[model samples]
Target: SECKPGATFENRTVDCGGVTIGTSCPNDSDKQKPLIILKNATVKNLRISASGGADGIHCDSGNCTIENVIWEDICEDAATNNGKTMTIVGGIAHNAKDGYGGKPDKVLQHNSKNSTTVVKGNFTLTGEHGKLWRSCGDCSNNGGPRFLTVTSATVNGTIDSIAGVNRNYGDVATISGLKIKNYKEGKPPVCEEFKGVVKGQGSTEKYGEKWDTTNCKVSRSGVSKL
Candidate 1:
């Protein structure tokens, strides 16, 4: 169904339970394929897939919530937040190819004015070189001032030569009770400068043994028991 503004959908299975919506749409530079265009609603239990020059789901400006969504074999991105606030509680994204050097785009892309992404469940991104979250300053409408919080989740994946979370630009970020482990050896400079906090059993030893998050400007808030 073509979702309208302020429409809420839940417990819906799209395309198929185990089918890939391949690159069926022609490549349009000005437009991207979206299974559903969302705004200020609650969505859950959706399975989507898409190929080049497209995305599984695209969200417009709003404070929306999504849970239990699955994305696979996506060429560009799995889910994107065009602008505003979006939160994904549980999801699985994997097998994305960007058609260049085996490096795919971020499974989740967030760009909005004062946007926030809070993942609080079992979310995973599986690939050789892909990102879990990509934050940008130029996604839409003169972007800036974004925030990301991953609390009580397990995010473990493999990046060929980069961190799972890539920051195009941002203001603040926060991660709590998350277990992030990268499977490959990457560079040192992983994140950007931001006023943030990481505590309550949070750990970011994903890049490598020598990897560090000094530039991100996020510190542990409580006991480092993890």
Candidate 2:
């Protein structure tokens, strides 16, 4: 069921069940076609399974809280947001990938200003070279946005890293208690591409090799914040 514009969807399961979303629309342009559009709403315990592309959820504007949602085999980024405040907690994003040359961006894309995205708790994620979170000023016309924090998240597969671009001119991006485990042998290059102040502590462990500390700068006596 298509959520009416500006409607709240909660406490329900939307099982696409092998059905693909956003396929009926034209993809010749760069415009995004979202399966579910939300604004000023609260979504909880929602389960969505679909083949990706221009699919997945979009938070158009205002503030929203999405909790305990599970998105499986999403072919692209699970969600994008132009909202002011969006909080994602206790959700699972599995196997989000580039579907047919689609724009496989981030699991959560922040495009607005003063946007505070607090991703906490066991939010499991899986992707390949797909940035888990991204902040862009152009997506909201909010020049110099601020405040993006992620803590206590887990990664099950290979993902690039979390990012807040300098072009957005935002405040610090705080990341803490992030655990990453790649089934592949040897330590996957986790958080190596992260740019910004990744404060807080986390661990990345792989199958065959001991985790490397090269991607992170560990100071003696825990005096540094980087």
Quote the lDDT for 172 in model 1: 49
Candidate 1 wrongly placed segments (more than 4 Å): 1-31, 50-53, 96-102, 139-141, 160-170, 181-190, 193-226
User: Candidate 2's C-alpha lDDT?
Assistant: 0.53
Model 1 TM-score is 0.64
TM-score of each: 0.64, 0.64
Error of 1 at 168 (Å): 11
The whole-model C-alpha lDDT of candidate 1 against the native structure comes to 0.50
Q: What are the lDDT figures for the candidates, one per model?
A: 0.50, 0.53
Error of 2 at 19 (Å): 13
Clashes of each: 1, 1
Tens digits of per-residue lDDT, candidate 1, 1-226, equal: 4332223333342222433333443444355556655676666665554343255566675766667776655545667776477777777766634542135656667766577766667565554335556565333234355666666554445443222332333444555554445422222123333222233333222322212353243344310221
Give me the candidate number with maximum lDDT: 2
Give me the displacement of residue 151 in model 1, in angstroms: 1.0
Candidate 2 regions with alpha-carbon error over 4 angstroms? 1-32, 96-104, 127-129, 137-142, 182-226
